[PDB]
Ligand SMILES: Nc1ccn([C@@H]2O[C@H](COP(=O)(O)OP(=O)(O)OP(=O)(O)O)[C@@H](O)[C@H]2O)c(=O)n1
Ligand SMILES: Nc1ccn([C@@H]2O[C@H](COP(=O)(O)OP(=O)(O)OP(=O)(O)O)[C@@H](O)[C@H]2O)c(=O)n1
Ligand SMILES: [Mg+2]
């Protein structure tokens with residue numbers, strides 16, 4: 072059971088452009104992710120999937136695996152599919168490039184889930200959040216059953232707060248562990264109505280009966296989209312040491 | 313493949329005491345439901361599960377079948393399990409006692425779904441609704457996959473309208489079709505957190521990985537909850553004549 076990590080790092084960014092080559096305390100964001108990916112046990116390879124060369128050059132610079140990919144992809148998942156075709160593996164882990172504060176142990180937990188249950192198509196992460204945090208649509212909630220299998224993913228605060236005291240929310244940490252086969256019969260997947268309405272690509276798998284299991288971890292640090300928190304990333308990154 | 317129809321009709325009601333016996337165009341509400349259930353093809357038995365002797369009598373009064381049950385039942389569902397033990401069948405259909413405007417064909421569509429797939433645990437119904445309606449916490453929304461399997465049931469507008477033009481909604485028509493086995497292991501099922509927050513008992517099935525398939529129908533007539541709705545249906549059913 073070989074497993075590899077893939078890190079999508081497009082240059083073009085609607086919000087903050089060239090977001091991956093951004094300097095977070097001496098290193099380019101993308102590098103922080105790479106180094107951390109390298110610390111994950113059980114992984115045979117760590118690849119960065121890029122579309123622009125200013126990234127590929129940046130990556131090779133620190134000696135990272137730089138595989139060039141199409142500059143047309145509408146989503147990460149797609150770009151990952153293209154890499155699944157050239158880099159052989161049983162398990163693919165997709166780590167976003169805008170999260171320089173990922174926890175190598177969280178990833179290990181994710182990959183362990185895949186290993187503990189071979190029949191599991193996809194694994195992903197989540198963590199508890201206040202009902203105050205579950206209000207913001209930028210935040211994505213997830214609800215699961217006893218087996219931790221995902222029921223649904225939404226921008227709406229689910230479950231609804233009827234008996235509000237009994238409500239418990241879980242943010243969804245956008246990392247995924249895919250079974251090679253899943254990626255292979257993926258391009259054939261048609262976009263679902265919930266997907267397009269919600270603007271959540273993972274719902275394209277649920278539309279197709281493809282089970283996704285969630286794994287809970289501790290409140291994770293901030294991602295990197297808002298240059299405002301970007302100071303907290305640097306401040307937390309810089310402090311972290 | 314024997315299938316029976318169960319109609320829970322407890323005497324009690326926070327706003328319409330005796331409700332099952334309320335008069336709509338000449339007959340007590342419960343009768344309407346019964347007569348309509350009797351029109352459904354493929355059903356071997358139509359039973360009314362009650363908790364009161366006055367409710368029992370009335371049903372015997374017009375030639376219907378009745379069965380007394382624990383007056384301490386907490387829910388129409390838990391009342392059904394008790395009937396599952398006395399009346400043998402492979403499929404159980406639970407029709408509400410406060411919905412005299414049920415459509416015999418909708419139930420047939422429901423029973424057919426269970427028959428077309430022996431492996432299906434439970435089947436239910438739904439129907440399209442505007443986003444303006446879906447806003448009401450009072451209305452239970454449901455979202456499904458390509459095979460029409462339910463992903464989640466909530467009072468929150470799901471799917472969330474990120475790209476509203478893509479958001480299409482379904483109101484959950486609360487009728488059920490239970491495979492005998494499902495009812496046999498029901499009392500062992502523990503209440504789920506999502507079920508408690510949203511106050512939706514069907515969510516105790518999903519928490520247990522027990523698939524529920526939804527079938528779409530045309531917008532259904534209203535039930536009898538408050539006396540405004542009572543006069544609301546009374547009218548409808550009279551102008552139908
Ligand atoms: N076609 C795409 C889309 C996304 N990504 C990658 O997926 C991660 C996060 O995606 P996202 O949050 O959507 O960032 P952007 O794609 O740049 O869009 P935005 O800035 O608005 O969030 C990043 O590593 C990004 O480069 C990618 O490689 N190729
Ligand atoms: N302990 C119970 C609870 C409910 N039911 C039956 O389940 C159906 C619908 O129940 P519900 O949706 O909960 O409506 P009500 O409970 O009657 O709402 P209210 O208390 O406000 O009248 C009705 O046929 C009702 O008689 C039952 O037989 N026994
Ligand atoms: Mg991002």
Ligand SMILES: [Mg+2]
Nearest residue numbers: 410535536537
């Ligand atoms: Mg009612």
